Amino acid sequence: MALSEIETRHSEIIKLENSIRELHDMFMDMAMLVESQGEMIDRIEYNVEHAVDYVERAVSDTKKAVK
Amino acid sequence: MARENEMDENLEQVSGIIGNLRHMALDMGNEIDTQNRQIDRIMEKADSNKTRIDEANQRATKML
Amino acid sequence: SNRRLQQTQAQVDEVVDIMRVNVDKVLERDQKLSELDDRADALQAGASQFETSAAKLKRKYW
Amino acid sequence: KLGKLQYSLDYDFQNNQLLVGIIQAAELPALDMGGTSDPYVKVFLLPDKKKKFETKVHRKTLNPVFNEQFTFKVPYSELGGKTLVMAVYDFDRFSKHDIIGEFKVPMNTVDFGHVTEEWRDLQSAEKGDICFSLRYVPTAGKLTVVILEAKNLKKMSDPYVKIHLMQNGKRLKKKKTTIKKNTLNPYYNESFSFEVPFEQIQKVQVVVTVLDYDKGKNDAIGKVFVGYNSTGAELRHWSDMLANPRRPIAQWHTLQVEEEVDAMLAVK
Amino acid sequence: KLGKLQYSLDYDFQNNQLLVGIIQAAELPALDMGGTSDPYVKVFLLPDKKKKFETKVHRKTLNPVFNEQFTFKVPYSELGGKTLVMAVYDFDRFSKHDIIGEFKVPMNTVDFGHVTEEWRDLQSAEKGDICFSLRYVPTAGKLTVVILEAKNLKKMSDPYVKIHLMQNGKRLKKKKTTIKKNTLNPYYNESFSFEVPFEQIQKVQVVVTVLDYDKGKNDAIGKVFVGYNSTGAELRHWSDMLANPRRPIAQWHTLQVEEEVDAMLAVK
Amino acid sequence: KLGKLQYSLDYDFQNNQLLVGIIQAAELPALDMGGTSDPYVKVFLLPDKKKKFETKVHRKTLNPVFNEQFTFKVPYSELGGKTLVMAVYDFDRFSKHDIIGEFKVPMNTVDFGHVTEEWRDLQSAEKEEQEKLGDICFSLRYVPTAGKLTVVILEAKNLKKMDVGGLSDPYVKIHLMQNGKRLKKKKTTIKKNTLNPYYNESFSFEVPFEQIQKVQVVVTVLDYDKIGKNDAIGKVFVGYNSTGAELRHWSDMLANPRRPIAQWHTLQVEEEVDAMLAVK
Amino acid sequence: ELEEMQRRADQLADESLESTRRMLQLVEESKDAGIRTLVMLDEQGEQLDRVEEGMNHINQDMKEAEKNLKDLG
Ligand SMILES: [Mg+2]
Ligand SMILES: [Mg+2]
Ligand SMILES: [Mg+2]
Ligand SMILES: [Mg+2]
Ligand SMILES: [Mg+2]
Ligand SMILES: [Mg+2]
């Protein structure tokens, strides 16, 4: 080999490190977004359960009202 | 050559871990898709019940 | 052995190409979830209103 | 500068629908924390507020490639009075999606028949000075407007001063000066005189505009107006010209956009 | 309140000199023992520290009438970059003459040509609170700023809270709340969320400002800032937000003047 | 308390070799009958335990003088990240030679240029660590109302080699035990030739709320050969009569219902684990 | 020139080595981030299921309420 071979080796290796780093950052962003969306789902399920309660009580009341 | 081999081992481990990352990315993406379809379903049903409850509330307050 | 270096590189590139698509799909999921949140809030609001009206109607026709 | 947008356009007469294709975008400015924005393109028709067509959101790229296609089923007759809108948006999870850029295309200038594909600059929806002396003699009815000097004019520069005299929205008199080439601040010192009776002195418009000279199309650097319905240093200078007869009052003025000036002049 | 000053102003182009007339003063505060001050007015030009022009000293009147005149021989071209200063002084035989009031007039906003005469308020050269909660989750990169409640706001009040997000001196995000009318202490309880990555968390500015609402011109009540280069309870609350993740920390804050805040923000 | 050790250290740049001299030792504790031990010192490069050097055995002295020299043909560049180990052993003719002491010298703290020679106090050698050194990560989720137990095998790492001259062929077997009996039997897909197997496979079990404090969850990572008996790499258990991070993960599963908690666990030998499961 | 060249080569060797170490660390962080991401996906998934059951229950209840209101009118 020579210095050219070692230099190209080093270059391609650095390239690999940068690609790896981009992959990493992508995974980090992934985890982040999924977490925030998780909180969003928390409040969604909250509103939904409240809605269910209200609907149930309403249905009971009308059901007792008709008869 | 020890310098070179040490590095070689590193690259092999990185290779394996990268493969596992591939598998994980596939599972991740797939389940994300399926969950997206499910969310679509949820919004369909939720809009349906929204209309249901609006019309029902109007009809209920109509008899008052 | 440049073969292993370039092969590993190709693996990394592939996984990247997977992950960016996954990320975009996740963003779409964020949109859908947000709209679902608004829809759910409106839903429970209408639910409470209808519950009140139902209370009135029960206290009327029974 | 807000980056550019490459798009494609064509019309299908077989299905009677407009085929608007969003290819890609380039050199988009960063609006988010990390140093890169999350762009997605919203495309719709101005005539109808039908649900807007939006591309999928791409994460953290200042050069996003959408290569998406949208179809607006509208005949060729209604097309003439329509307007295409392509606006680039920035995605944010916890706030309002800020607009990166926007672009408007009149559908009467567009030529369908050959496959169109172009790059267009995005613009912001939110979006030099000239000094001269004014002298009015009520007795002689002479108005002496002496163009003194301009400064900090926009480069490409070849500046020259044109002075116009208006009344009730009509452009009566037109004058101009010598052409000073390659100067950041041109010095003229050129006097102009106007025949203005004392009975209409409160109904005249004096409009001084500094322009650029190419052999072609006449460019525009800046323009200012003094007199009726004027405010700021303009009304001040005018009131000084009136209050001080048989004597010239020199003053500086900041160049305004031609749109606003003509909008103020549109009162008549 | 330091009383008012009536003065006259005009420019003589025949002798090329500025004619500044000191008419009188009213409702001047008492600074001496006997219950009345010994006022005299010092007038001069800011551009040149030429010997100051002072009126004669009137003994024991809170409404002194000077009706004096001063002339500053300065051409109209140099005038634009000048500043008129009229300060009212209190005479004391055995000590430094304490200043009653002061007034500064930019010579580029002043209009000469018509005889000016105005009353102006003297000012002193020496010259509400908002409570909210901060929550930052490093993992999700979410910043939850919940505006809780304001108190003791200045009357004329119509209070509403605007929350801004800054970085490196640039104003990035802008949000606001509901408008509570006719309240001394408005209660909002409104939550806001921001997209902030973990790598720039030490370079962000969170600025909460309580303002008054008129239909017009937007008034200002108070403003506070938390984060980078912050001190006092602000830096404390910030450090608590950082040290306590996935949990909101509520805190009160005293409203500061906008000048000082913007001066601290001017570091970039 | 055993005693001190005088040694010499220097580097020959002319031959590119490390010169380690064992001078002597003093005040060594006696472990033999006569009131004095039979000491001998084993010296080797700390980084790689290859080509260890041993001194001659001195009979019945608590102050042995070796005055011996050893040479480590190691370049000067590699030397910096290499440590030296000098351990004092006691010779016994009819049993295992007990270690009296040991001493480690980092080559980044050592200054070459002047011939070094010092006395250093001996210390007690660290006990042998666990052999497996493998770990398995999974998630636990229990909702008390429906009585559903969701065990999701995520991924193992640093597993012990089971095949000859290569990596292993791992697969996860899950047993559910109670009062020593193995009730349910589950297993995963077989990932071949992997140092770190990724499964991401979910399993569900029917466990009532009244018996949640009396159940055993046994996770076992094993190796797969077609021919003959399939051996076992490692195993851990959580639940009834569990200790350590295992009981912690269990308590996290309990304290957090309708939510899955993922955690790592260190693989133990099957003998001790099964011995723990035979209890009560 | 020659000494500096050999030292340069060994330098590049070391640099590439520590670079690969950095890679190992990065793919480890990536690995863990991915794992916890999947965990979150399972949790949020079950939550979405509960949301769906909620919607179904709402639908049936409002169907009954519709029945009662039609029986009252
Ligand atoms: Mg963004
Ligand atoms: Mg030009
Ligand atoms: Mg006095
Ligand atoms: Mg007000
Ligand atoms: Mg012995
Ligand atoms: Mg095997």
Tab-separated table of N, CA and C in Angstrom, chain E residues 130-252:
chain	number	residue	atom	x	y	z
E	130	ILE	N	-46.271	38.913	37.402
E	130	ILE	CA	-46.867	37.791	36.682
E	130	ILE	C	-46.315	36.460	37.191
E	131	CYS	N	-47.216	35.514	37.448
E	131	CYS	CA	-46.836	34.187	37.921
E	131	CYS	C	-47.197	33.125	36.887
E	132	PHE	N	-46.235	32.248	36.613
E	132	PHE	CA	-46.408	31.179	35.635
E	132	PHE	C	-45.590	29.949	36.020
E	133	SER	N	-45.805	28.845	35.308
E	133	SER	CA	-45.083	27.609	35.588
E	133	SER	C	-44.254	27.171	34.384
E	134	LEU	N	-43.056	26.661	34.648
E	134	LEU	CA	-42.174	26.183	33.589
E	134	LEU	C	-41.956	24.678	33.701
E	135	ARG	N	-42.039	23.995	32.565
E	135	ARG	CA	-41.834	22.555	32.513
E	135	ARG	C	-41.071	22.163	31.257
E	136	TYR	N	-39.933	21.502	31.441
E	136	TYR	CA	-39.130	21.055	30.311
E	136	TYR	C	-38.795	19.577	30.425
E	137	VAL	N	-39.118	18.825	29.377
E	137	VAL	CA	-38.782	17.414	29.318
E	137	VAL	C	-37.674	17.206	28.296
E	138	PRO	N	-36.462	16.870	28.768
E	138	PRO	CA	-35.294	16.713	27.895
E	138	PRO	C	-35.500	15.622	26.848
E	139	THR	N	-36.179	14.549	27.245
E	139	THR	CA	-36.413	13.404	26.372
E	139	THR	C	-37.338	13.746	25.199
E	140	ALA	N	-38.463	14.391	25.493
E	140	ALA	CA	-39.442	14.730	24.463
E	140	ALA	C	-39.156	16.086	23.823
E	141	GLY	N	-38.279	16.861	24.450
E	141	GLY	CA	-37.919	18.176	23.949
E	141	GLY	C	-39.083	19.146	23.971
E	142	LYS	N	-39.965	18.966	24.949
E	142	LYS	CA	-41.158	19.792	25.078
E	142	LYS	C	-41.010	20.814	26.203
E	143	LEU	N	-41.303	22.075	25.903
E	143	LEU	CA	-41.273	23.126	26.916
E	143	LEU	C	-42.687	23.612	27.225
E	144	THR	N	-43.164	23.317	28.431
E	144	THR	CA	-44.527	23.669	28.817
E	144	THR	C	-44.565	24.905	29.711
E	145	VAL	N	-44.840	26.055	29.103
E	145	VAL	CA	-44.977	27.304	29.838
E	145	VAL	C	-46.456	27.598	30.057
E	146	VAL	N	-46.905	27.468	31.299
E	146	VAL	CA	-48.305	27.698	31.629
E	146	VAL	C	-48.490	29.037	32.334
E	147	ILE	N	-49.077	29.997	31.625
E	147	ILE	CA	-49.387	31.298	32.202
E	147	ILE	C	-50.500	31.148	33.232
E	148	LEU	N	-50.173	31.433	34.490
E	148	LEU	CA	-51.124	31.297	35.587
E	148	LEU	C	-51.900	32.584	35.859
E	149	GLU	N	-51.249	33.591	36.440
E	149	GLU	CA	-52.001	34.772	36.878
E	149	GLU	C	-51.159	36.030	37.105
E	150	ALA	N	-51.717	37.184	36.748
E	150	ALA	CA	-51.062	38.469	36.988
E	150	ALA	C	-51.733	39.213	38.141
E	151	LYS	N	-51.033	40.197	38.703
E	151	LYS	CA	-51.545	40.953	39.844
E	151	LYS	C	-50.960	42.370	39.900
E	152	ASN	N	-51.734	43.293	40.472
E	152	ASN	CA	-51.325	44.683	40.696
E	152	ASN	C	-50.848	45.379	39.424
E	153	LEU	N	-51.512	45.096	38.311
E	153	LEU	CA	-51.154	45.696	37.035
E	153	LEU	C	-51.577	47.161	37.009
E	154	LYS	N	-50.897	47.966	36.195
E	154	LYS	CA	-51.198	49.391	36.134
E	154	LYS	C	-52.549	49.622	35.462
E	155	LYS	N	-53.349	50.497	36.059
E	155	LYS	CA	-54.681	50.804	35.547
E	155	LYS	C	-54.638	51.551	34.216
E	156	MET	N	-55.444	51.086	33.265
E	156	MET	CA	-55.547	51.686	31.935
E	156	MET	C	-54.184	51.923	31.287
E	157	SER	N	-57.795	48.242	34.133
E	157	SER	CA	-56.939	47.941	32.992
E	157	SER	C	-57.531	46.816	32.144
E	158	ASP	N	-56.994	46.636	30.942
E	158	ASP	CA	-57.415	45.550	30.059
E	158	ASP	C	-56.246	44.612	29.763
E	159	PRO	N	-55.897	43.753	30.732
E	159	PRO	CA	-54.677	42.942	30.649
E	159	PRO	C	-54.794	41.662	29.820
E	160	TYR	N	-53.700	41.306	29.151
E	160	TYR	CA	-53.581	40.030	28.452
E	160	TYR	C	-52.107	39.640	28.329
E	161	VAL	N	-51.825	38.342	28.382
E	161	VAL	CA	-50.448	37.859	28.414
E	161	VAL	C	-49.950	37.355	27.058
E	162	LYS	N	-48.833	37.919	26.607
E	162	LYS	CA	-48.142	37.466	25.404
E	162	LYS	C	-46.830	36.773	25.765
E	163	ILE	N	-46.614	35.579	25.222
E	163	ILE	CA	-45.397	34.823	25.502
E	163	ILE	C	-44.554	34.657	24.234
E	164	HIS	N	-43.304	35.110	24.299
E	164	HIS	CA	-42.380	35.035	23.169
E	164	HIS	C	-41.196	34.093	23.415
E	165	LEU	N	-40.700	33.489	22.338
E	165	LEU	CA	-39.535	32.604	22.390
E	165	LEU	C	-38.397	33.108	21.502
E	166	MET	N	-37.274	33.440	22.140
E	166	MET	CA	-36.113	34.057	21.490
E	166	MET	C	-34.874	33.155	21.444
E	167	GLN	N	-33.980	33.448	20.498
E	167	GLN	CA	-32.701	32.749	20.370
E	167	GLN	C	-31.662	33.614	19.649
E	168	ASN	N	-30.502	33.795	20.278
E	168	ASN	CA	-29.416	34.614	19.728
E	168	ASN	C	-29.862	36.019	19.322
E	169	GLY	N	-30.821	36.572	20.057
E	169	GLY	CA	-31.305	37.918	19.798
E	169	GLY	C	-32.427	38.039	18.783
E	170	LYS	N	-32.818	36.923	18.173
E	170	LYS	CA	-33.895	36.939	17.189
E	170	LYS	C	-35.189	36.457	17.842
E	171	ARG	N	-36.300	37.096	17.493
E	171	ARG	CA	-37.596	36.721	18.044
E	171	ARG	C	-38.247	35.634	17.198
E	172	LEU	N	-38.187	34.395	17.680
E	172	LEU	CA	-38.709	33.259	16.929
E	172	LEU	C	-40.218	33.097	17.088
E	173	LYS	N	-40.657	32.626	18.252
E	173	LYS	CA	-42.080	32.312	18.429
E	173	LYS	C	-42.878	33.397	19.152
E	174	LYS	N	-44.146	33.538	18.770
E	174	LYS	CA	-45.054	34.486	19.410
E	174	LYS	C	-46.417	33.860	19.711
E	175	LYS	N	-46.823	33.900	20.976
E	175	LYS	CA	-48.125	33.383	21.404
E	175	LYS	C	-48.835	34.388	22.310
E	176	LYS	N	-50.140	34.203	22.499
E	176	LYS	CA	-50.912	35.073	23.384
E	176	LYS	C	-52.123	34.365	23.992
E	177	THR	N	-52.750	35.015	24.970
E	177	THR	CA	-53.856	34.422	25.717
E	177	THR	C	-55.194	35.117	25.471
E	178	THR	N	-56.205	34.714	26.238
E	178	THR	CA	-57.528	35.327	26.182
E	178	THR	C	-57.494	36.699	26.856
E	179	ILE	N	-58.426	37.572	26.480
E	179	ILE	CA	-58.440	38.939	26.986
E	179	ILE	C	-59.435	39.095	28.137
E	180	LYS	N	-58.921	39.272	29.350
E	180	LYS	CA	-59.772	39.524	30.509
E	180	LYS	C	-59.965	41.027	30.702
E	181	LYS	N	-61.215	41.478	30.647
E	181	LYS	CA	-61.513	42.908	30.691
E	181	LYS	C	-61.905	43.381	32.091
E	182	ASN	N	-61.440	44.578	32.446
E	182	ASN	CA	-61.743	45.213	33.731
E	182	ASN	C	-61.407	44.326	34.928
E	183	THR	N	-60.115	44.071	35.122
E	183	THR	CA	-59.636	43.251	36.231
E	183	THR	C	-58.308	43.786	36.763
E	184	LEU	N	-58.173	43.840	38.084
E	184	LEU	CA	-56.922	44.270	38.696
E	184	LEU	C	-55.920	43.123	38.685
E	185	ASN	N	-56.436	41.900	38.787
E	185	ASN	CA	-55.605	40.702	38.735
E	185	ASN	C	-56.284	39.613	37.903
E	186	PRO	N	-55.886	39.497	36.628
E	186	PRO	CA	-56.460	38.541	35.673
E	186	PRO	C	-55.964	37.113	35.881
E	187	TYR	N	-56.884	36.151	35.877
E	187	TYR	CA	-56.522	34.744	36.005
E	187	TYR	C	-56.748	34.044	34.670
E	188	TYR	N	-55.690	33.443	34.134
E	188	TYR	CA	-55.744	32.833	32.810
E	188	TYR	C	-55.720	31.309	32.872
E	189	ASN	N	-54.657	30.769	33.465
E	189	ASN	CA	-54.411	29.328	33.502
E	189	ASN	C	-54.405	28.740	32.094
E	190	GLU	N	-53.511	29.244	31.248
E	190	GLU	CA	-53.436	28.788	29.863
E	190	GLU	C	-52.052	28.229	29.547
E	191	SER	N	-52.024	27.039	28.958
E	191	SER	CA	-50.773	26.323	28.730
E	191	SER	C	-50.241	26.511	27.315
E	192	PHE	N	-48.921	26.611	27.203
E	192	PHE	CA	-48.259	26.706	25.911
E	192	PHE	C	-47.132	25.682	25.825
E	193	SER	N	-46.901	25.151	24.629
E	193	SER	CA	-45.861	24.150	24.430
E	193	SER	C	-44.899	24.566	23.322
E	194	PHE	N	-43.621	24.245	23.502
E	194	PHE	CA	-42.597	24.635	22.543
E	194	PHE	C	-41.668	23.477	22.204
E	195	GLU	N	-41.227	23.445	20.953
E	195	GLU	CA	-40.357	22.393	20.451
E	195	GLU	C	-38.897	22.797	20.627
E	196	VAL	N	-38.283	22.326	21.709
E	196	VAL	CA	-36.907	22.694	22.028
E	196	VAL	C	-36.034	21.462	22.250
E	197	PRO	N	-35.095	21.211	21.326
E	197	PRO	CA	-34.139	20.100	21.424
E	197	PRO	C	-33.212	20.239	22.626
E	198	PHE	N	-32.613	19.130	23.046
E	198	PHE	CA	-31.771	19.109	24.239
E	198	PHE	C	-30.416	19.780	24.014
E	199	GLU	N	-30.025	19.947	22.753
E	199	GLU	CA	-28.701	20.477	22.429
E	199	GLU	C	-28.641	22.003	22.406
E	200	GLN	N	-29.792	22.660	22.463
E	200	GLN	CA	-29.824	24.121	22.433
E	200	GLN	C	-30.537	24.693	23.657
E	201	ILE	N	-30.769	23.842	24.648
E	201	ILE	CA	-31.557	24.211	25.822
E	201	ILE	C	-30.877	25.323	26.623
E	202	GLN	N	-29.556	25.419	26.508
E	202	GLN	CA	-28.797	26.421	27.244
E	202	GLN	C	-28.626	27.711	26.451
E	203	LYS	N	-29.354	27.835	25.340
E	203	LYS	CA	-29.246	29.020	24.489
E	203	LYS	C	-30.615	29.556	24.064
E	204	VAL	N	-31.597	29.478	24.960
E	204	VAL	CA	-32.951	29.920	24.638
E	204	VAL	C	-33.433	30.996	25.602
E	205	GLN	N	-34.311	31.869	25.116
E	205	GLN	CA	-34.870	32.932	25.943
E	205	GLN	C	-36.387	32.795	25.995
E	206	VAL	N	-36.962	32.728	27.193
E	206	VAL	CA	-38.419	32.699	27.298
E	206	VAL	C	-38.902	34.015	27.900
E	207	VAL	N	-39.596	34.818	27.099
E	207	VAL	CA	-39.989	36.158	27.528
E	207	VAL	C	-41.502	36.286	27.689
E	208	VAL	N	-41.962	36.443	28.927
E	208	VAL	CA	-43.391	36.598	29.183
E	208	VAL	C	-43.716	38.058	29.485
E	209	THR	N	-44.622	38.635	28.702
E	209	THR	CA	-44.987	40.040	28.865
E	209	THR	C	-46.494	40.235	29.032
E	210	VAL	N	-46.879	40.973	30.068
E	210	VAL	CA	-48.277	41.321	30.286
E	210	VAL	C	-48.542	42.695	29.685
E	211	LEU	N	-49.535	42.776	28.807
E	211	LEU	CA	-49.826	44.017	28.096
E	211	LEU	C	-51.268	44.470	28.303
E	212	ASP	N	-51.538	45.721	27.942
E	212	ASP	CA	-52.881	46.282	28.036
E	212	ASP	C	-53.526	46.302	26.653
E	213	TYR	N	-54.839	46.091	26.600
E	213	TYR	CA	-55.524	46.000	25.316
E	213	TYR	C	-56.489	47.158	25.078
E	214	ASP	N	-56.131	47.999	24.117
E	214	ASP	CA	-57.033	48.995	23.554
E	214	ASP	C	-57.354	48.582	22.125
E	215	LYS	N	-58.490	49.019	21.594
E	215	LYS	CA	-58.806	48.676	20.222
E	215	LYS	C	-57.643	49.282	19.456
E	216	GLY	N	-55.987	51.228	16.569
E	216	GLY	CA	-55.382	51.850	17.740
E	216	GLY	C	-53.937	51.477	18.018
E	217	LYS	N	-53.510	51.713	19.258
E	217	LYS	CA	-52.147	51.414	19.686
E	217	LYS	C	-52.095	50.426	20.855
E	218	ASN	N	-51.236	49.421	20.729
E	218	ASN	CA	-51.057	48.395	21.753
E	218	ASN	C	-50.201	48.923	22.904
E	219	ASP	N	-50.799	49.073	24.083
E	219	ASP	CA	-50.064	49.587	25.236
E	219	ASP	C	-49.155	48.517	25.833
E	220	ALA	N	-48.398	48.884	26.864
E	220	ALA	CA	-47.523	47.928	27.538
E	220	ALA	C	-47.592	48.072	29.057
E	221	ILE	N	-47.854	46.971	29.758
E	221	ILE	CA	-47.887	46.989	31.218
E	221	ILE	C	-46.532	46.605	31.813
E	222	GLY	N	-46.081	45.390	31.510
E	222	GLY	CA	-44.816	44.882	32.020
E	222	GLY	C	-44.260	43.708	31.235
E	223	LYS	N	-43.010	43.343	31.521
E	223	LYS	CA	-42.360	42.220	30.846
E	223	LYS	C	-41.240	41.609	31.696
E	224	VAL	N	-41.088	40.287	31.612
E	224	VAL	CA	-40.013	39.574	32.299
E	224	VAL	C	-39.403	38.536	31.360
E	225	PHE	N	-38.157	38.148	31.624
E	225	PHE	CA	-37.483	37.160	30.788
E	225	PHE	C	-36.750	36.126	31.638
E	226	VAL	N	-36.763	34.879	31.180
E	226	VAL	CA	-36.104	33.790	31.891
E	226	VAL	C	-35.213	32.988	30.936
E	227	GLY	N	-34.099	32.480	31.457
E	227	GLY	CA	-33.197	31.640	30.690
E	227	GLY	C	-31.736	32.057	30.674
E	228	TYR	N	-31.181	32.179	29.473
E	228	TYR	CA	-29.771	32.511	29.278
E	228	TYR	C	-29.463	33.946	29.702
E	229	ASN	N	-28.380	34.104	30.461
E	229	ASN	CA	-27.956	35.395	31.009
E	229	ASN	C	-29.032	36.027	31.886
E	230	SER	N	-29.748	35.193	32.630
E	230	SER	CA	-30.756	35.679	33.563
E	230	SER	C	-30.229	35.621	34.991
E	231	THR	N	-30.729	36.512	35.838
E	231	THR	CA	-30.342	36.548	37.243
E	231	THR	C	-31.577	36.722	38.116
E	232	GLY	N	-31.407	36.555	39.424
E	232	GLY	CA	-32.510	36.699	40.356
E	232	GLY	C	-33.395	35.468	40.408
E	233	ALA	N	-34.684	35.677	40.656
E	233	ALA	CA	-35.641	34.576	40.735
E	233	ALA	C	-35.853	33.915	39.377
E	234	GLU	N	-35.493	34.627	38.314
E	234	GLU	CA	-35.620	34.103	36.960
E	234	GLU	C	-34.659	32.941	36.730
E	235	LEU	N	-33.377	33.174	37.002
E	235	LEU	CA	-32.363	32.134	36.865
E	235	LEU	C	-32.633	30.978	37.822
E	236	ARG	N	-33.198	31.295	38.983
E	236	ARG	CA	-33.556	30.266	39.951
E	236	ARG	C	-34.623	29.358	39.367
E	237	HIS	N	-35.705	29.966	38.887
E	237	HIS	CA	-36.825	29.222	38.321
E	237	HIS	C	-36.384	28.394	37.117
E	238	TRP	N	-35.519	28.977	36.292
E	238	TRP	CA	-34.975	28.278	35.133
E	238	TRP	C	-34.167	27.051	35.546
E	239	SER	N	-33.275	27.241	36.513
E	239	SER	CA	-32.435	26.157	36.999
E	239	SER	C	-33.281	25.072	37.653
E	240	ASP	N	-34.436	25.465	38.182
E	240	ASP	CA	-35.356	24.507	38.777
E	240	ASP	C	-36.078	23.717	37.695
E	241	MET	N	-36.393	24.391	36.594
E	241	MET	CA	-37.011	23.733	35.451
E	241	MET	C	-36.052	22.703	34.861
E	242	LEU	N	-34.777	23.070	34.787
E	242	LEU	CA	-33.757	22.175	34.251
E	242	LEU	C	-33.497	21.000	35.189
E	243	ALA	N	-33.319	21.300	36.473
E	243	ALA	CA	-32.996	20.282	37.468
E	243	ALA	C	-34.167	19.339	37.726
E	244	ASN	N	-35.380	19.812	37.466
E	244	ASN	CA	-36.570	18.995	37.665
E	244	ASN	C	-37.292	18.752	36.346
E	245	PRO	N	-36.939	17.656	35.662
E	245	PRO	CA	-37.558	17.297	34.385
E	245	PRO	C	-38.855	16.511	34.555
E	246	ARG	N	-39.695	16.544	33.521
E	246	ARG	CA	-40.996	15.873	33.517
E	246	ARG	C	-41.879	16.337	34.675
E	247	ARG	N	-41.633	17.556	35.147
E	247	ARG	CA	-42.377	18.113	36.270
E	247	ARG	C	-42.375	19.637	36.185
E	248	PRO	N	-43.559	20.256	36.325
E	248	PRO	CA	-43.702	21.711	36.212
E	248	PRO	C	-43.473	22.457	37.523
E	249	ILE	N	-42.674	23.517	37.460
E	249	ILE	CA	-42.381	24.337	38.627
E	249	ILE	C	-43.041	25.702	38.472
E	250	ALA	N	-43.922	26.039	39.407
E	250	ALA	CA	-44.635	27.313	39.373
E	250	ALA	C	-43.897	28.376	40.179
E	251	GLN	N	-43.912	29.611	39.684
E	251	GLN	CA	-43.216	30.704	40.353
E	251	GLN	C	-43.807	32.070	39.991
E	252	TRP	N	-43.665	33.016	40.916
E	252	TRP	CA	-44.057	34.405	40.707
E	252	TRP	C	-42.867	35.202	40.183
